[model samples]
Target: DVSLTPSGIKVNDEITLLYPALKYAEELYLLINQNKINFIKSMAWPAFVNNISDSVSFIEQSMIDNQNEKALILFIKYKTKIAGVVSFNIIDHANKTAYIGYWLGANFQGKGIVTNAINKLIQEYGDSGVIKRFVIKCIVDNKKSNATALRCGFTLEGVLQKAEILNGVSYDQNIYSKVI
Candidate 1:
């Protein structure tokens, strides 16, 4: 692991994305349960940090059925505790690219945590196989997310209007790509 400290901010090479382990699944549940709404928003629309939850039965089922060959769940931890989550599973292996998405808790935002998490993932999986590109998306209005992508070397492709619908709202999504 590597650590960098500048302006008293510490960035550490922490844990990778992890699946829902039965041993600590409850803790994972707590993290999401406590912020249920925020988690949904991040994954869907309005992209706000108002809630979280670990109740995605469909996603969990995907993990159970696929394992490392298909999709994998990864969690970022701080000092042994989950702080954030990121994943870029093989949505289409033949396409030689993966869809990437991530979120950090409210407390961890604006502190370079997202950049570090993204960097770690890219390093871990960028050169290993047919995965040649990483794709990240954000609602068009999410400036913070777009900025993070720029800071982390992701290039904006274009806008996808009416691309995502959540809670009866249509969001214009911004597509970003990073070539490995």
Candidate 2:
């Protein structure tokens, strides 16, 4: 079992996979060039942004021009270091919901760190009152992602067949939801 700390929500202690901020440029490079990261190896992300520079530019622009709802790039902070990345876009005006997506560094697996970050985010979202719903999705064949969703108590909404195309194959996706 894992528990969240009281100071986990602060800027210095909060989750931040893109840390060093400078390294984000390189991280984005690998992420864009590689067909699939270790965490999501089964399915390659279909979209491309041309280059890492483009991706970083987009992140910076999005953060700057944030609309009513904010975007959070939550990272599991471990010993003052970024352990993983969880990117989420929150829609406060519409039902106060957030659509979350995450990935862990290959180095830090099976440590229950991500679980603690999720729990902390859930509480933070609840207290903010600007986030009432949390949603996550994973390819149906991706057993590992589904297991995480289940472990975290997300409600499965059924499988969407041919939901996404990765490489040349269309894959089914399982959608999960949690309401506060």
Candidate 3:
């Protein structure tokens, strides 16, 4: 059964990326809830991920989308823990662009884990010629995410006017992209 697990993309010695499965549902569910306040502030998924059942639902959907090649969603495996998640929120074959979305629990921040992981994914995608551009969009107020984009070598393209809706409110988003 061990080999049945989907292979992971190794990021250095400590970090890895793998598809999420039901076996990890409980732990990931708690990780999300533990960071719910911060996650809910900037992310849309937190509002819907209220319990373990939702984690199962999410993993099911992720597997479907991943297999269909619509989106690539992976659990950020840090050391021996489920750090959080990193995903191409959308993969547009027509434009050859991948929109990146990611989150790591408060406990896993500041170790350069996300920076390294993203760099690896970018290298993999760019080297394959499957994706020509990578983009990260976040609310202008999210300094953490904005900083991550910069660290990952994405250049700020511009701000989109009232581009994101969260909690029934509108927010401007900063668009950052790296075109290879």
Candidate 4:
């Protein structure tokens, strides 16, 4: 877990990044709306959606993967609120590379919460000897996400034309990378 004292708060100024616990499932279930999960599902994978059982299974598997050094999944917390989630998926130790995926709830969007969380992740794990590069992908039409990627210091590598298919429709994705 990573905890920091954030500025501009009168009380309870801490923001934390940590793996999801089973105890957080209820609140997390409330936050994982269709729109939020679908957006990423369309951009990346089809199985991102979840029900109670699916979410629980994912949380359990993710924890196991993290323990095995195969992945890192963390939730963003503001005080007592679960703000969002971030992850390093498909961690390839042989290649020293990993893919990053993240999302913030509607209320938490545009507040730099994710950007700060990502910076903290890099600071904590960037030079940890296993990962040397972090990759991010955003649908070409998501301007806000593109801006966030830039704000977090990821360099635009190129676009993957028709790289993703959702509901039988194709979409392009912009690939960005940050090399530590």
Give the lowest summed-lDDT range of ten residues in model 3: 1-10
Query: Tens digits of per-residue lDDT for model 3 on 1-180?
Result: 232234668878888888767898999999999999888898877988888999999999999999888999989988889999999989999999999999999999998988988898888898779999999999999999999999998999999999999998899999999999
* Candidates by TM-score, descending order: 3, 4, 1, 2
Better of 1 and 4 by TM-score: 4
Index of the highest-lDDT prediction: 3
Candidate 1 per-residue C-alpha lDDT over 89-174 given as tens digits, one digit per residue, 9 for 90 to 100? 44568887878767776766677777887786676567666677888888887778888888889998999988877777889989
* Per-residue lDDT of candidate 4, residues 65-122 (tens digit): 8888788887778767887778887788898888888877777776778788778777
Worst 10 residues of 4 by lDDT: 2-11
TM-score of each: 0.76, 0.71, 0.95, 0.82
The C-alpha lDDT values of all candidates are 0.65, 0.62, 0.90, 0.74
Encode model 2's per-residue lDDT on 1-180: one tens digit a residue: 133333235423444333224345555555444533453355454254467776577556545534324677644555654555665655545668787776565555576666656666777676668678888888987876788888878999888888877767888899998888
Model 1 segments more than 4 A misplaced:
1-16, 45-59, 65-68
Candidate with better TM-score, 2 vs 4: 4
lDDT of 2: 0.62
Clashes of 4: 0
User: Where does model 4 exceed 4 Å of error?
Assistant: 1-13, 34-50
Best by TM-score: 3
Q: In candidate 2, which residue ranges exceed 4 Å CA deviation?
A: 1-55, 58-62, 65-70, 90-92
Error of 3 at 53 (Å): 0.6
